[PDB]
Amino acid sequence: SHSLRYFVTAVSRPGFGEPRYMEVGYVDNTEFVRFDSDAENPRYEPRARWIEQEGPEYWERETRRAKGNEQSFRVDLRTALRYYNQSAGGSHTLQWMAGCDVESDGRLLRGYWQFAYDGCDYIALNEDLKTWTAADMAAQITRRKWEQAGAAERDRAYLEGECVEWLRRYLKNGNATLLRTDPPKAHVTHHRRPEGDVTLRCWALGFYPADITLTWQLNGEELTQEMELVETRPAGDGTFQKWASVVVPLGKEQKYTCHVEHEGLPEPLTLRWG
């Protein structure tokens, strides 16, 4: 499955300037375009090398779309203050994410066209791509407005057509790097703790994509017995990192083996303290 998605943010700062507005496009979690209102003459900019082959028309068109979108959000931020009876003094955040997830076949697996206000769901186009689910009565006002205007049809047209068409185009533009798989450079560290036992930590560095499965086994078994791990984390260069550890009795380290699973590994890895 592959995806083309745009993440948009509008943050107000009443009395101190126009709302900060941002748009970020991603193809399978890879950022390729971004528009930041914070510049003298803001425009959409390339973020991946494979999007630089898009001609000038494309960039001026998207820049115009982004500015048009920025205007709607300024109005939205004002409307939200009235819907929620809030004062014009505080900063508020309005977010939007729209895009498509398309199966290997070219069929639309799932479409997105949803919003959030101050950190939580506000409204979302349902999977039927026809009706909406509102988070509260304020958002219900929006829903009634959009259903009566039939705004969903316009959104669905984009999700099933243009979004899908361009995702396919992008996947060709970036064939070389959008499907890259950097295998993990794995090693095991041994730490003796005050408790008397030992912490065996299995490390995985410089891999890509972020997806990965690190597991520990005892004499080749279901060592799911509570192991410690951390959230997969990024590096400046775009690769990821992760580790998983378990406590073991000092003297029986060679009994435990770490197994690393990753898309870039034709065959899973098995490491020992050795």
């Binding site: 748009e23 494309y58 979108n69 709607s72 409307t79 819907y83 895009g99 919003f115 316009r154």
Partner: peptide, 10 residues
């Protein structure tokens, strides 16, 4: 290419 709000405000 991205989505357009097309002035369909909340």
């Amino acid at each position: 290419r991205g989505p357009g709000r097309a002035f369909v405000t909340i």
